[PDB]
Design a protein around this motif. Structure first.
Motif, short mmCIF file in Angstrom:
data_model
loop_
_atom_site.label_atom_id
_atom_site.label_comp_id
_atom_site.label_asym_id
_atom_site.label_seq_id
_atom_site.Cartn_x
_atom_site.Cartn_y
_atom_site.Cartn_z
N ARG A 147 0.88 -1.21 0.00
CA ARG A 147 0.00 0.00 0.00
C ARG A 147 0.90 1.24 0.00
NH1 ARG A 147 -4.78 -1.27 -1.09
NH2 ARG A 147 -6.67 -1.03 0.15
N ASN A 148 1.95 1.25 0.83
CA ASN A 148 2.89 2.40 0.88
C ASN A 148 3.55 2.59 -0.49
OD1 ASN A 148 3.86 2.28 4.40
ND2 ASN A 148 2.14 3.23 3.36
N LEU A 149 4.05 1.55 -1.14
CA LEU A 149 4.60 1.71 -2.52
C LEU A 149 3.52 2.30 -3.43
CD1 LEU A 149 6.43 -1.71 -2.73
CD2 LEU A 149 7.49 0.56 -2.38
N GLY A 150 2.26 1.85 -3.28
CA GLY A 150 1.12 2.37 -4.04
C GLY A 150 0.99 3.87 -3.84
N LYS A 151 0.93 4.33 -2.60
CA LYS A 151 0.85 5.78 -2.26
C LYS A 151 2.04 6.53 -2.88
CE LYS A 151 -1.69 4.92 2.05
NZ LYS A 151 -1.55 4.79 3.52
N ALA A 152 3.27 6.04 -2.73
CA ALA A 152 4.54 6.69 -3.16
C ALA A 152 4.59 6.92 -4.67
CB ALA A 152 5.71 5.81 -2.78
N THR A 153 3.96 6.02 -5.41
CA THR A 153 4.29 5.70 -6.81
C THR A 153 3.09 6.04 -7.71
OG1 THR A 153 6.07 4.16 -7.32
CG2 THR A 153 3.83 3.30 -7.56
N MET A 213 0.81 3.95 -8.60
CA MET A 213 0.57 2.78 -9.48
C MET A 213 -0.31 1.72 -8.82
SD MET A 213 4.18 2.10 -11.39
CE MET A 213 5.49 3.21 -10.88
N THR A 214 -0.91 0.85 -9.63
CA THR A 214 -1.77 -0.26 -9.16
C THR A 214 -0.90 -1.34 -8.54
OG1 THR A 214 -1.74 -1.49 -11.17
CG2 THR A 214 -3.36 0.31 -11.02
N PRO A 215 -1.42 -2.03 -7.51
CA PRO A 215 -0.70 -3.11 -6.84
C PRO A 215 -0.17 -4.20 -7.78
CG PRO A 215 -2.77 -2.62 -5.67
CD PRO A 215 -2.75 -1.79 -6.93
N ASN A 216 -0.97 -4.61 -8.77
CA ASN A 216 -0.58 -5.67 -9.72
C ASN A 216 0.73 -5.26 -10.39
OD1 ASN A 216 -4.00 -6.25 -10.18
ND2 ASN A 216 -2.61 -7.74 -9.30
N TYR A 217 0.85 -4.00 -10.83
CA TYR A 217 2.01 -3.55 -11.63
C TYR A 217 3.24 -3.48 -10.73
CZ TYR A 217 -0.55 -2.59 -16.06
OH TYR A 217 -1.25 -2.70 -17.22
N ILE A 218 3.08 -3.02 -9.49
CA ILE A 218 4.20 -2.93 -8.51
C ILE A 218 4.65 -4.35 -8.17
CG2 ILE A 218 4.87 -2.20 -6.22
CD1 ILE A 218 2.56 -0.05 -6.50
N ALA A 219 3.72 -5.26 -7.96
CA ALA A 219 4.03 -6.64 -7.53
C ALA A 219 4.76 -7.36 -8.67
CB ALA A 219 2.77 -7.35 -7.14
N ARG A 220 4.30 -7.17 -9.91
CA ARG A 220 4.87 -7.84 -11.10
C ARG A 220 6.35 -7.44 -11.25
NH1 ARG A 220 2.11 -6.93 -16.90
NH2 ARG A 220 0.31 -7.38 -15.57
N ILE A 221 6.64 -6.14 -11.18
CA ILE A 221 8.04 -5.61 -11.19
C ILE A 221 8.85 -6.27 -10.07
CG2 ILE A 221 9.46 -3.67 -10.53
CD1 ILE A 221 8.75 -3.42 -13.38
N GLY A 222 8.32 -6.26 -8.85
CA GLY A 222 9.02 -6.82 -7.68
C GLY A 222 9.34 -8.28 -7.93
N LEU A 223 8.36 -9.04 -8.41
CA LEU A 223 8.49 -10.49 -8.68
C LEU A 223 9.61 -10.69 -9.70
CD1 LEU A 223 7.58 -13.39 -8.55
CD2 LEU A 223 5.89 -12.84 -10.34
N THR A 224 9.64 -9.82 -10.71
CA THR A 224 10.65 -9.83 -11.79
C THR A 224 12.01 -9.52 -11.18
OG1 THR A 224 8.94 -9.18 -13.37
CG2 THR A 224 11.16 -9.06 -14.13
#
Length: 114
Positions: free
Chosen positions: A17-23, A25-36
């Motif tokens: 949620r904090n990355l969401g606020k900072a950025t 962006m949608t959770p799916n897109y942040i999570a996909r990058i992180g997973l990558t």
């Protein structure tokens, strides 16, 4: 088998949620990058660290049209490291998802101003 719905750790869900606020962006897109990012990290992720009490993701929304490619990449990296995809795919996948989000959070939490 299906891997349809999966849950990240609760404290990682807060970090997301904090990355969401900072950025913005949608959770799916942040999570996909992180997973990558986590899938290209040398060290194996910890199989001990993370609960499944946090946010739920759908593989279709999370990985998108690259789903089979991400799945296959995860199965290869497992077999290489010594894990069994038939027993541990969910656990191993979530270890990378959680670790990916933590890694981004560890830099981006610092901003505070964001």
């Amino acid at each position: 088998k299906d891997l349809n719905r999966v849950q990240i750790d609760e404290s990682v869900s807060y970090k997301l949620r904090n990355l969401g606020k900072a950025t913005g962006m949608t959770p799916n897109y942040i999570a996909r990058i992180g997973l990558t990012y986590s899938l290209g990290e040398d060290r194996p992720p910890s199989m001990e660290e993370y609960d499944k009490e946090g946010k739920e993701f759908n593989r279709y929304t999370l990985l998108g049209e690259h789903d089979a490619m991400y799945i296959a990449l995860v199965k290869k990296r497992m077999l290489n490291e010594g894990y069994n995809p038939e027993t541990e795919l969910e656990d191993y996948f979530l270890a990378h998802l959680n670790r990916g989000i933590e890694t981004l959070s560890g830099r981006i939490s610092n901003l505070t101003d964001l």
